[PDB]
Amino acid sequence: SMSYTWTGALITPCAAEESKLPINALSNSLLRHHNMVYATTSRSAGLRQKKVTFDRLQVLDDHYRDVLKEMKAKASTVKAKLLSVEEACKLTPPHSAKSKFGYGAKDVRNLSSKAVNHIHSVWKDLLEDTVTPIDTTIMAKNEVFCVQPGRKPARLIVFPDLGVRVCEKMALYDVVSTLPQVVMGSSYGFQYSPGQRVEFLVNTWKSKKNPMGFSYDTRCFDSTVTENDIRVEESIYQCCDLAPEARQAIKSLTERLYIGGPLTNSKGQNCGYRRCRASGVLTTSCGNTLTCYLKASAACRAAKLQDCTMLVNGDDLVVICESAGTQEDAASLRVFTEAMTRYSAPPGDPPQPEYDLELITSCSSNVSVAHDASGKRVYYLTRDPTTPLARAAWETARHTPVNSWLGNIIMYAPTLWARMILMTHFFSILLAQEQLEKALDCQIYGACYSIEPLDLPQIIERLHGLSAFSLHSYSPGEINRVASCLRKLGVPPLRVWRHRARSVRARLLSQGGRAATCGKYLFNWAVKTKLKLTPIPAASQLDLSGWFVAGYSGGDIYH
Ligand SMILES: CC(C)(C)[C@H]1C(O)=C(C2=NS(=O)(=O)c3c(CNS(C)(=O)=O)cccc32)C(=O)N1Cc1ccc(F)c(Cl)c1
Known about the structure:
Its cofactor is Mg(2+). The chain is an alpha+beta fold. It contains 21 helices and 15 strands.
């Protein structure tokens, strides 16, 4: 069937949308080439609609059903619980979209009786009615990029009312938090810190006699998801040991929301109908991960890839296997792709075999190597810093709900671009505003986290190790990619950043306490006469539970 049917009604914004890079007094210290930076708006939604709208055909074979059976066997070992209304309410981001029924996120969060009453009413209706399609809003996402000589159209987000979103948590939060690791084991990617992911990638790579690897880019994964896939997902959820009410609600959410339903714009006009994955439901991450792992695991068998190890984060897939040499690897991957295509996950750009781990991009990241304090080689994950820096420029001039810069510093802390540019720039800004103590929101694996900037040294230590504060002798390939980015964007040379970082560090040191700790660890690279970095005390008090358990993209989750 068609992924979507459209009425002609337009996808509408809630507020005016800026597409041009806002400029303030801080902008130029980061980036001179402002016209290279843009944000998507709803006004390009028609271009997206076009490309996410196609017919899906699905041909399912024995490998498919075999893998599914294995997945269900493991799923049946999971026991999951219902969350109370209040438990589910506390998982709601403060900035979440408000209900059409006269209450908002903060009402939910502080448990107003108005919110809670509507929630209980939504739940009761889920138990009673397992057929009536549930309403969703379709919006365009405003995301920032750099011009790639041209522009990406806005992504679409499809989400049900707040009342329904709290109910999803009640029925499925424990499931989507617990099931994927039990079903998929070490192949489930959202369980890893950056440190663990690079560890798992390197160990996997060198466990092969002659390693070959490839990332598989599905063309618009969400759109490729069929009703079959979503019913198949539900059948996996139902293997779990669940309370009768959770079973009923899960069945009801599947039939009424997950499978499809009507699409309404912000003005309340009907825009059409969806028959593929909604990107803004609780099950998007878990559903996509299970479905990608199933199709890929079965496609590996069909292609006869040898010792194929998968790493799956939603729709993001990387496979590492044994080479049969270049001719056979190329033919293998074609069989893999034909299978995936038969399963309704055709590729965007065709996959290509890789023989160098560092040339493989997965979760928009590639492995690279640097050296630590004692010369002892260390692997870490990095990326082309263009988009992170284009977004950092936007966020320098505009207050954003989610600070991408903060998530990039957290996840890319060991990189030369994050240490030298992002750390230096934003700590300078926090200092000027005396907002070092001010807790800031960022999204990691789709979930929103409130973070104190001053806890960054502890956070980085836990996620990457001390190495992250002592890394040097980065690779010519990486150094060239950074330098090329700065040239393109008109970002000041690294000597300018080194100069600035010295100032930032000194200023932090002068401050004392946690701020001096930020000065010492984060900016030890800037000083020629290096200080000794010991393991950070009282770091092992702060619990990073909720971190690196599961993915929740589009799932309206707050920790
Ligand atoms: C915060 C950033 C930097 C953005 C982080 C992230 O949170 C993600 C992600 N967040 S997400 O939206 O949950 C996500 C998906 C979600 N896809 S889906 C709809 O659920 O099917 C897939 C891949 C990756 C993601 C990511 O790729 N990242 C890059 C990255 C990932 C893992 C690492 F170990 C390192 Cl070092 C860097």
